[PDB]
Design a protein around this ligand. Structure first.
Ligand code: HEM
Ligand code: HEM
Ligand code: HEM
Ligand code: HEM
Lengths: 146, 141, 141, 146
């Protein structure tokens, strides 16, 4: 991904303030409430028929953390998201059969979540940096589709 | 939003398809799977090779639904109500995929009926297939 | 379609916004121009720099349309009639761009009202903005 | 773009039979009729009020020829679309102010125009290869946007 030196600092500084369990939980939770059809992949986690069941499902929250923690891994290799996420792209395509469009939807929710928690700090510029990050991550996870 | 001319163009088009609806739609899905592999993530349970019984079966069922839509252009939400429920509650196909199938449907039509697929006819069919796509995702949230 | 609860959530969000509508919307648009630089192809005549007065002025206008939308939730087509003519016949903004501004409106509201911006409110607002977008492009073809 | 050897031969074989004037005329024409907001860039091309005006617009047809000549040229550099179209990409952004979504729209129209002309020689495999190329070209053309 094509990021300026000022943008990488911004990306790394904000993420050091990120609780991956809490925001991980919330990002995946918000995906499933805002775009209810994304709940199809997690139906085996328990009752997800309502917004409130979704928000209280221990497996959804724990998966959001796992997902954000993987997203954090990408941040450690921003010049090579394709290499970093190569195995996971193959995993999501071949084994999980996840439509990569979902990666984009999760990206958008992640930005709204960072904004929600960091107020003023998540400037238009900090946002621009993360919007480029989430699209890089999305593209990388989609890259090995076939 | 579907003008009287758009409905005329749509029924004109589908009447030329004739008894080829099932084959054309079968061919549209294969075009979708080959050119847009992400859409294959919705059919891990199908053999998606050329000529597979499952795709042919699916083309037939999708074609019939389009035939119904063509027959009920004044009230698509009412003609597609059960499929609407199905795609919202169970199938849950991300809405970007409907455009990809619509696109492969136009390629199929255009390739099979070159002289009848005029620019204005194309314009009407695109509005229709987008209309059907809106109806089928209308209950997602 | 916006349910009663969605409309409750939209009206609560916007009531909580109050006199901040111009500032919040002007901010959205800046977040849009910087995050999604393709959107600036529609404003070649604008000062798009950070803090822009032109963008501020435009945000006031856009906020006004939003406020009017919020006040006429049952009949958005009628409230936004003049705006859907203009976007359709003059501005002709590609439908893809309306999501980009919606996404930054959600970024702006969540940033400024984190306690009110709940998953449920988030969902209701996204549906609302998508409804505004659909109405603004309803006359494109 | 990444085409197999079979696909590249298929791309090149179909294009040798393309009447650049005829199909470029049609493709731009169908863009303006199918997606009428695209006419915003052609206000000075004369009458575009009706679909049959668009279809008889000498400047629309000519420009369509010009566009597909350039497309054609880009098919000689399928390993490097971004380098080929870098100058046109800056021009479309900085001079013409053309939302690059339009490139995606034209790509789809082009695929349809190719299907229409070639019929059953434009196989699902042949469309798939051409889908790769039109997304590659659209992508090269959006690449220098800022
Ligand atoms: C965007 C929406 C996404 C959806 C709907 C989705 C779907 C899934 C599903 C269903 C699982 C398996 C859960 C299970 O069956 O136990 C999974 C696993 C996983 N996903 Fe995602 N995924 C998404 C995006 C992401 C993103 C953005 C990342 C960050 C790189 C990510 C990283 C992971 C990881 C690390 C695993 C565990 C894989 C393993 O080692 O078994 N996913 N995903
Ligand atoms: C790319 C877009 C679409 C995708 C990915 C998709 C996905 C699916 C899937 C996975 C099934 C279940 C198939 C099976 O297991 O047999 C299905 C069923 C079905 N869908 Fe779609 N769909 C799409 C668009 C459409 C459209 C445009 C129509 C309108 C004709 C449609 C109507 C149907 C019908 C008639 C069935 C079978 C229903 C039944 O058995 O009761 N779908 N869809
Ligand atoms: C969905 C939210 C939107 C709303 C509420 C909205 C509404 C408005 C309003 C109120 C005006 C000013 C009308 C006047 O008094 O002359 C306007 C003009 C304009 N709109 Fe939108 N619109 C929206 C989306 C968009 C998007 C996404 C774009 C493109 C990125 C766009 C492009 C424009 C342009 C280029 C103008 C003319 C600006 C000028 O006066 O120089 N609109 N719109
Ligand atoms: C699809 C939507 C597109 C739009 C709306 C668009 C718009 C335009 C416009 C408005 C011009 C200048 C008008 C004129 O020549 O009088 C132009 C020039 C040009 N465009 Fe595009 N374009 C599109 C796609 C493409 C594509 C796909 C290509 C090539 C692959 C292309 C290549 C060119 C070339 C070669 C010129 C002439 C440049 C020059 O002589 O300076 N365009 N375009």
């Amino acid at each position: 991904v094509n990021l300026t030196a000022a943008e990488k600092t911004q990306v790394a500084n904000l993420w050091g303030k990120v609780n991956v369990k809490e925001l991980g939980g919330e990002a995946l939770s918000r995906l499933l409430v805002v775009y209810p059809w994304t709940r199809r992949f997690f139906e085996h986690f328990g009752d997800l028929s309502t917004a409130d069941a979704v928000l209280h499902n221990a497996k959804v929250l724990a998966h959001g953390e796992k997902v954000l923690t993987s997203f954090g891994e990408g941040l450690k290799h921003l010049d090579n998201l394709k290499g970093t996420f190569s195995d996971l792209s193959e995993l999501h395509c071949d084994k999980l059969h996840v439509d990569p469009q979902n990666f984009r939807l999760l990206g958008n929710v992640l930005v709204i979540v960072l904004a929600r928690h960091f107020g003023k700090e998540f400037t238009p510029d900090v946002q621009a940096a993360y919007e480029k990050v989430v699209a890089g991550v999305a593209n990388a996870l989609a890259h090995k589709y076939h | 939003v579907l003008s009287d001319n758009d409905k005329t163009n749509v029924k004109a088009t589908w009447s030329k398809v004739g008894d080829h609806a099932s084959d054309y739609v079968a061919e549209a899905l294969e075009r979708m799977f080959f050119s847009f592999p992400t859409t294959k993530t919705y059919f891990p349970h199908f053999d998606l090779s050329h000529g597979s019984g499952q795709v042919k079966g699916h083309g037939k069922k999708v074609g019939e639904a389009l035939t119904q839509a063509v027959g009920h252009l004044d009230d698509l939400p009412s003609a597609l109500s059960a499929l609407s429920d199905l795609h919202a509650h169970k199938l849950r196909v991300d809405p970007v995929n409907f455009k990809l199938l619509s696109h492969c449907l136009l390629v199929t039509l255009s390739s099979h009926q070159p002289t009848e697929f005029t620019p204005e006819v194309h314009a009407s069919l695109d509005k229709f297939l987008s209309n059907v796509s809106t109806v089928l995702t209308s209950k997602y949230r």
